[PDB]
Amino acid sequence: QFRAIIESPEGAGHVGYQYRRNTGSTMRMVSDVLDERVSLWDFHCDPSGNVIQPGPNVDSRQYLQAAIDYVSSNGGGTITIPAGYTWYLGSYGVGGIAGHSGIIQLRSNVNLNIEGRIHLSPFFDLKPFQVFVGFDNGDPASSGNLENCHIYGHGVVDFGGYEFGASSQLRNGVAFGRSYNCSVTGITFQNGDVTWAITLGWNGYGSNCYVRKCRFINLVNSSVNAAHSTVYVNCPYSGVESCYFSMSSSFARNIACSVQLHQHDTFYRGSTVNGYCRGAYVVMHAAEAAGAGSYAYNMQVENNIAVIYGQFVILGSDVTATVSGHLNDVIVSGNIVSIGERAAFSAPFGAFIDIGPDNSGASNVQDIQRVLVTGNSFYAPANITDSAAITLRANLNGCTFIANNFDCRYMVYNAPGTTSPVVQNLVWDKSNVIGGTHANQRAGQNLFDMQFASVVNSTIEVQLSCEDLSMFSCILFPASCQLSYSKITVDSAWTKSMSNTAVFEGNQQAGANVYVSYPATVNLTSYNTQGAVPFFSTDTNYAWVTSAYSLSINENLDFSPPATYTNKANGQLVGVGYNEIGGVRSVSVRLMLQRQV
Amino acid sequence: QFRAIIESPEGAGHVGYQYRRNTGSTMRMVSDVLDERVSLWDFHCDPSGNVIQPGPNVDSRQYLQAAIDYVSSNGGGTITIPAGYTWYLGSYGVGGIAGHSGIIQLRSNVNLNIEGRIHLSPFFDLKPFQVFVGFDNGDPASSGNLENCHIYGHGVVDFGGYEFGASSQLRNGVAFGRSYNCSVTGITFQNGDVTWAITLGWNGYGSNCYVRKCRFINLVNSSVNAAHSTVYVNCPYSGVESCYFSMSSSFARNIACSVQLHQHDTFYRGSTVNGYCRGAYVVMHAAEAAGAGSYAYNMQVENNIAVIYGQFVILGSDVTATVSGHLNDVIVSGNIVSIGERAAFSAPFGAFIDIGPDNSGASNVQDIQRVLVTGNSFYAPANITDSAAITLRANLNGCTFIANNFDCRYMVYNAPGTTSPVVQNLVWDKSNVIGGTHANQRAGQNLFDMQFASVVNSTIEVQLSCEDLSMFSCILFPASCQLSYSKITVDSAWTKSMSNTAVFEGNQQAGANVYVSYPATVNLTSYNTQGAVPFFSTDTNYAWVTSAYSLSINENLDFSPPATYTNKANGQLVGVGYNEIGGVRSVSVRLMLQRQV
Amino acid sequence: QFRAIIESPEGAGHVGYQYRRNTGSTMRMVSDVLDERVSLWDFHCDPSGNVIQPGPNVDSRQYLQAAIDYVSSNGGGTITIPAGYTWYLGSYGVGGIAGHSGIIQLRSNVNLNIEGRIHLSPFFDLKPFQVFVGFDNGDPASSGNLENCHIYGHGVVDFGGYEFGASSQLRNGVAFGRSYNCSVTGITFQNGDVTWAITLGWNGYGSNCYVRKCRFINLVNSSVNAAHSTVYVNCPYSGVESCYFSMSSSFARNIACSVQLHQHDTFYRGSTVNGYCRGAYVVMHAAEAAGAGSYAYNMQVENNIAVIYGQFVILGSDVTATVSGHLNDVIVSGNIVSIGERAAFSAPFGAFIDIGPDNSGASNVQDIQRVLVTGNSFYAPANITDSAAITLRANLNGCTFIANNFDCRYMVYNAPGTTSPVVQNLVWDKSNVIGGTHANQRAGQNLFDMQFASVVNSTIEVQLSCEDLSMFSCILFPASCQLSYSKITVDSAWTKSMSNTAVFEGNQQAGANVYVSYPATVNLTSYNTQGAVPFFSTDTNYAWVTSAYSLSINENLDFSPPATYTNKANGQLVGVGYNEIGGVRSVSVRLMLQRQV
Ligand SMILES: CC(=O)N[C@@H]1[C@@H](O[C@H]2O[C@H](CO)[C@H](O[C@H]3O[C@H](CO[C@@H]4O[C@@H](C)[C@H](O)[C@@H](O)[C@H]4O)[C@@H](O)[C@H](O)[C@H]3O)[C@H](O[C@@H]3O[C@H](CO)[C@@H](O)[C@H](O)[C@H]3NC(C)=O)[C@H]2O)[C@H](O)[C@@H](CO)O[C@@H]1O
Ligand SMILES: CC(=O)N[C@@H]1[C@@H](O[C@H]2O[C@H](CO)[C@H](O[C@H]3O[C@H](CO[C@@H]4O[C@@H](C)[C@H](O)[C@@H](O)[C@H]4O)[C@@H](O)[C@H](O)[C@H]3O)[C@H](O[C@@H]3O[C@H](CO)[C@@H](O)[C@H](O)[C@H]3NC(C)=O)[C@H]2O)[C@H](O)[C@@H](CO)O[C@@H]1O
Ligand SMILES: CC(=O)N[C@@H]1[C@@H](O[C@H]2O[C@H](CO)[C@H](O[C@H]3O[C@H](CO[C@@H]4O[C@@H](C)[C@H](O)[C@@H](O)[C@H]4O)[C@@H](O)[C@H](O)[C@H]3O)[C@H](O[C@@H]3O[C@H](CO)[C@@H](O)[C@H](O)[C@H]3NC(C)=O)[C@H]2O)[C@H](O)[C@@H](CO)O[C@@H]1O
Ligand code: NA
Numbered sequence A, B, C: 001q002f003r004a005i006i007e008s009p010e011g012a013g014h015v016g017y018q019y020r021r022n023t024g025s026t027m028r029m030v031s032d033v034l035d036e037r038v039s040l041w042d043f044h045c046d047p048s049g050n051v052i053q054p055g056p057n058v059d060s061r062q063y064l065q066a067a068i069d070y071v072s073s074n075g076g077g078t079i080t081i082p083a084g085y086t087w088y089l090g091s092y093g094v095g096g097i098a099g100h101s102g103i104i105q106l107r108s109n110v111n112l113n114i115e116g117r118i119h120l121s122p123f124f125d126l127k128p129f130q131v132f133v134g135f136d137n138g139d140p141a142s143s144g145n146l147e148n149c150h151i152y153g154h155g156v157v158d159f160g161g162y163e164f165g166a167s168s169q170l171r172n173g174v175a176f177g178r179s180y181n182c183s184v185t186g187i188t189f190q191n192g193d194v195t196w197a198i199t200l201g202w203n204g205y206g207s208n209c210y211v212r213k214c215r216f217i218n219l220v221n222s223s224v225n226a227a228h229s230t231v232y233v234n235c236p237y238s239g240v241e242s243c244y245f246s247m248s249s250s251f252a253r254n255i256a257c258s259v260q261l262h263q264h265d266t267f268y269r270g271s272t273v274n275g276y277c278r279g280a281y282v283v284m285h286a287a288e289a290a291g292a293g294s295y296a297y298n299m300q301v302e303n304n305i306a307v308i309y310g311q312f313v314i315l316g317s318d319v320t321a322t323v324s325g326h327l328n329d330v331i332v333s334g335n336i337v338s339i340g341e342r343a344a345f346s347a348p349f350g351a352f353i354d355i356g357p358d359n360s361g362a363s364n365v366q367d368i369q370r371v372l373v374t375g376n377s378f379y380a381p382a383n384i385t386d387s388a389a390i391t392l393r394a395n396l397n398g399c400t401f402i403a404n405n406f407d408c409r410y411m412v413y414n415a416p417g418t419t420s421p422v423v424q425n426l427v428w429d430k431s432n433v434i435g436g437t438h439a440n441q442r443a444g445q446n447l448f449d450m451q452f453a454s455v456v457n458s459t460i461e462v463q464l465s466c467e468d469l470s471m472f473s474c475i476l477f478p479a480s481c482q483l484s485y486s487k488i489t490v491d492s493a494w495t496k497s498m499s500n501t502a503v504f505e506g507n508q509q510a511g512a513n514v515y516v517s518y519p520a521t522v523n524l525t526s527y528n529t530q531g532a533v534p535f536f537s538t539d540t541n542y543a544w545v546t547s548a549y550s551l552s553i554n555e556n557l558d559f560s561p562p563a564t565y566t567n568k569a570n571g572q573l574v575g576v577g578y579n580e581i582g583g584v585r586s587v588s589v590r591l592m593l594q595r596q597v
């Protein structure tokens, strides 16, 4: 009778409750209060309704999906994945997520509070998988949206350590899909060989998706893995903050990137990276331009800490047959980055910023401009030949450097004979501090190695802070690089003993709208007259010089060379010195040569 | 007997429980465990205690208030607003919040976990309202405090889309009141026409109030709305972080601001704004100085992303009959901001920083100083005439710009004929990079248009990075602007073809403590003597010049002009050149003119 | 029979439940659902199982420990400390935490959701204590680890106001121990006299430990307290973000620091400090080098707001008999800091950065380099004599300043007669803006007071932005300071009336690899010849000068002095001017003196 009802599954539905014995409160039943929360245990049961304990020999997938499906049908809620248990997944999902090698299908308004651990069983060894998928169709173009889905807690997603079976396979933790107001917070992703841990958005469809306070640990482990980017941000108004990324595999030093920022109004801030090849790509792929336009703008990489083996930030933009991608309005600021201990040339070329070619190697498709790199530090150990503040390997329409501290082998670099980028609006302000770790290492090398097709509307203000007499020059332009409407200066400090300071192998510093200054040694000879007397250079390669002035003391009593010099049409320098007593004088002086500055 | 007790509201109070069958655990009753949590369902009931389903025809207000009142009486706790339901509010509250058009009264230590949706019913159409109010008196001066009140969750506050009925009305989401350790986290505020979404503090009373990870979407929709600021921060030690603000209304481009920082030790960081007129005001209003003093100091606007139509940061301070407001010790850093696509003059004048007058238009009441603007980017499209790095429209006691990238029409601007601000300690360091988007657009315009009453103790170091021969000058001072104890320099790069570089329409560069340098074209003529020979300017307006030097090459073989020049009392320049052969020479040379530098 | 079972502690275990009457859901018992959560009430009971109310006369310690012990035995979970109650602790713990004066022992995977208040009873008055301890052994070297332990919520830890009984005692809130993935979030620590509130890690053992959104209020109150650092970060990959620190005690202005960053890859960001002596130490102690190596690198102090009375960031490194500590790769950025109102010399010497000696006073053990200080503001009121951008008191191997705004008494300072640091790679870029608050206060003082044993590979580019004729010099080197391979420049702006600009009391600016420039007044006299005519200095102390140029106008019609000058072997300057009419001329001119620049 009553006893039967009480012991039945409807029993709690018969036991009355009123909150805190408050006579103003609702007269409820116990079941109503229990129904305010929901866990995996409410679906983790056999066909007779008996609870099943999780474990390595139990496949929890169908139970978790049934939980998600049911809570979705009531307008959403939060399913707890209980602490103190490991929940194994041991089969693929069915329906719209099967095209994505999906395990679990996420649904709108259904949050997951992961307190325990979710592990992959060895069914997945050597196979593709995406553990949580928010697409609802195998074809992403035909997918509905995922909205208001949050995964959070103190728990763990463990990928079982399994290697990839083939390089062409894809593996992911969370693919939110066409995702609006979705987020992952607090979760540890660990122990795998995967392509991505989390992907946000799809080809610009989505908004307001975030990854916050998550850990990603040891997510590459094999030579089969083609590539890895821990978070791929493929919708606007989205980003990554306060996360921790670590790899230990040798392969990760060559293939793994922490973040991809691929749509406008996206950010990467406050995070720590160790053991990765790359920090972040900031890219507009034409192939990804469907949902949010063809421009990646308002891109922010700030206040991160990194030890990487390749490049910290990589910029790109590219084209398809019918769409052109553009990258502009970027800020890279406050980051403290180093190339980890490694041999020269043992990983991809070390760089703070890389202007990279497209995925096919094309360097003449990019449209990258209005970038600001400010207030960052970069260090590479002295042996790492392949380290640069910027490797400028594809067409650049602008990039501005102010008030950074770069301590590596090169400042600006591109390999000769390779690509010949067209460079516009490259600005290197004098407030960039050039470190001394690589002093004495630079035999045969140019600190600024301007291996470009052409440079226009650019500024390079070189300022040393210590000597490095091993370098061939501070800045060199090969004769193949056109230079125009530019300002190139070499501050004299720490340069007195340098054989070459600025080198223009095509004599490009003569251009009508080139503004330069740099130190040089010049031999002069005077006329014999007592009194005010001209001094003239012996060499005739100064027809471009607008003024010069002495950087040398005068050890003579009986005369003095000119303090300042102009030129003559034959290319000599000329200035008026003073012979206290007459005689032809011959001196070698260090001058600051100036053109239009 | 027993069956009756079990089915009664005291039934759960008779059913024993011990945690996990642990014999060391408390012998409790089921009701005790259920009493550890509380939801709206525990109060959302008719007078007989029967639960009422929420819905558009049910007014949930009295039930939610009864929940808050009761939990307050037990020392606090957290009330869940359940997921999967929309809870409508359909009447005003009563008592102390009625003076505030209040709906719900918040209470100390009573948190709200909003997982579902709270909507406004059409009772509120065309009426004022403040949805959650923490004042306890209609007169804020007579209000008690609100302490330890947190609103958080994945849920939503929806204002029903209703327009304002009259411009003089006020609408708000959360007014914490005189608020100490209060916060909103995770919540989406959307679909309204309101004055504010959240206000913190009252006239400096409050502390440690924050808005974190919230979304504000479409909160202005009509021409009736007088003004909108999404978060108003009116207590110290408080701020906004990691929020998302978006508007779509045309009206928002003219009236809406994201944040007001109005008391000391307040911050706005890490947020994204789109569609707003303004980013943040940083202001000390004398009228708001009661609870925390008359100074706004330690004000921080950092690492935000914005597309706005008017000004990004607006500074102010003002006076009342008996109190004077002061603003100092401000930092604006790491922000990436653009003026969105619009016609020139179609919204309030575009600016990165505005020094604005008080609410009555007064420009002679401000006391603003010790501000640092560093490491920001700003862009405005080329057609937007009305765009400036700084619009300096009221008295300024100091502002420092270092290492920014500004790409807009003007650097410094104020409209002539308007206000004549008194300017002190304006510092524009040479490390500020001036972009080229507006090159060729500047006919008739001065890049730095110094339309002030006076300038003192100021530094303007102009550095171009590309040519713009359309501009009238790089910097111009009208004769009405006094200039003293200042340093004004124009770097020569990209200026060779400029007719005017620096212009001093009152000849102010002659001042005893003015330090200047800029390029100019000068005609000279020599004496006929063979050998060392003087050259003299034909014009006599150089009595202020302390030295000059050549920026031009010398195309002659038979002579050379001086490399460097001094002046003479009649205002000629003079220097010593060299005539290899005699003859009177006549040349036109580009010189760098220098005074005391 | 059945009634007996129902009223027993196993009663809930007999009442059936199925979630939302879903026939696909698990057939459970009420007890199963209640067993999904756990609170202190489940252990806060007498030996017969009757619940005990908390209160000032009840010691809750044993109950909370039993809760932690039991949840640990099931693999972890989260224990709620209920809102609306104050839980008092009134005795020490036992076992491994007794060596640490421990109260509660934390355990792996057992989180604490503190919603109510935890108070200390007066048993603790005048005694040591560490409230929560994660070590499991009295000897930390023999301790196991604490993993996956999070303390969070809206609640409060209150230390009872009790003073220290003796300076040698230690008091702490949370010692996580050898701690991996542990964190504190949201908690208020208040009302004490303690050594630390939170400590992370032990001598480099630990990882991924964080303090986020916590408040620390009034944690020093007596003259007995030897020292206080609110958070001590002693494991890598760990940090402090978005916290609030306030003190009101006079003693805190002399003894209290907010944060210690003592291992690599640690951070302090986004926080607000008021009332403290110090902001953060960034230190590698050799004595703490066991778990993570001998180097502190990737150290980040960013975007903080502070009012302090001593120093903002303090750098250090030191040695033991067998280990040497090194500090490198540091970034200090975006901070807005002021010295609070106080009399000169009334608290430890005010500084933005201090290079401090070791704990024994040794200044010759440090290895600190590759530090970047950029984009910060610092202010000290005009009366505070003891205020500096950097106090450089121990050996320094490098520190770089770019684009800061420093407004205080000194730029670089060390006390004479004290330590004589060896300085390398000190870089002060010209983009640092020097404020004017202390103008007129600097009688007898040098703005840059270079009281060092030696300076090498250093750059000081002085740029004033207003006049201060009270200062003795802009930069002074005593004869005891060797100077070599350095660049020292004084911009002329605001210096015309200064008696001394740069001072080299040992004539160090003559060094072969010293690059300098600064203004000076020089008396010259010409020969009598009409026409081009030499001018020579009367004094002979210019043998080091490579060029000089006029900073003065020429008030004469009949002649002009040289615009530019070289030197002669006797130490005179010499240049060629012009006598329109003959005669011996005598002039006093302001020159820019230059050596190798
Ligand atoms: C690891 C990584 O991100 N590397 C980037 C590089 O990214 C490109 O190359 C990677 C290689 O893994 C991706 O291309 C692979 O995956 C795509 C997408 O998979 C299909 O679509 C998804 C939605 C579905 O779930 C899957 O089942 C597949 O059907 C394949 O089409 C492609 O053949 C394959 O090699 C990456 O693709 C992007 O991936 C993100 C995140 O999942 C998606 O949001 C995008 O839609 C998808 N883009 C496109 C154009 O399909 C490639 O873009 C970058 O290009 C490079 C420089 O920026 O940096 C790293 O090397
Ligand atoms: C939209 C906005 O913030 N605009 C600012 C501008 O702010 C001033 O103008 C706005 C217009 O809405 C506010 O003035 C309106 O509201 C105040 C306050 O309302 C009364 O007090 C509150 C506590 C109570 O709940 C209400 O029922 C009212 O009784 C009215 O007094 C005033 O008449 C009316 O126009 C704003 O007032 C401030 O509002 C904040 C946030 O609610 C309160 O904390 C302050 O106490 C209150 N200040 C004062 C002095 O009363 C005005 O300050 C800024 O001035 C401007 C430049 O900084 O930027 C934007 O335009
Ligand atoms: C307040 C503060 O941090 N001051 C720093 C200063 O720190 C050193 O001085 C303080 C003074 O309180 C600490 O030294 C005291 O404590 C240590 C450690 O206590 C023992 O070990 C812990 C684990 C155990 O729980 C305790 O029961 C004790 O057994 C004592 O050994 C020492 O005698 C005593 O004076 C501080 O020690 C460090 O403390 C942190 C945080 O608890 C531990 O993680 C470290 O292991 C421990 N270090 C060492 C070497 O033992 C001292 O390091 C800094 O040195 C200074 C400059 O950087 O700034 C502040 O003044
Ligand atoms: Na697919």
Ligand code: NA
Binding pocket: A369, A370, A371, A372, A398, A399, A400, B405
């Ligand atoms: Na730029």
Ligand code: NA
Binding pocket: A452, A453, A454, A480, A481, A482
């Ligand atoms: Na070429």
Ligand code: NA
Binding pocket: B099, B100, B101, B138
């Ligand atoms: Na009112």
Ligand code: NA
Binding pocket: B369, B370, B371, B372, B398, B399, B400, C405
């Ligand atoms: Na300033």
Ligand code: NA
Binding pocket: B452, B453, B454, B480, B481, B482
């Ligand atoms: Na005037």
Ligand code: NA
Binding pocket: C099, C100, C101, C138
């Ligand atoms: Na101990």
Ligand code: NA
Binding pocket: A405, C369, C370, C371, C372, C398, C399, C400
């Ligand atoms: Na450095």
Ligand code: NA
Binding pocket: C452, C453, C454, C480, C481, C482
């Ligand atoms: Na010495």
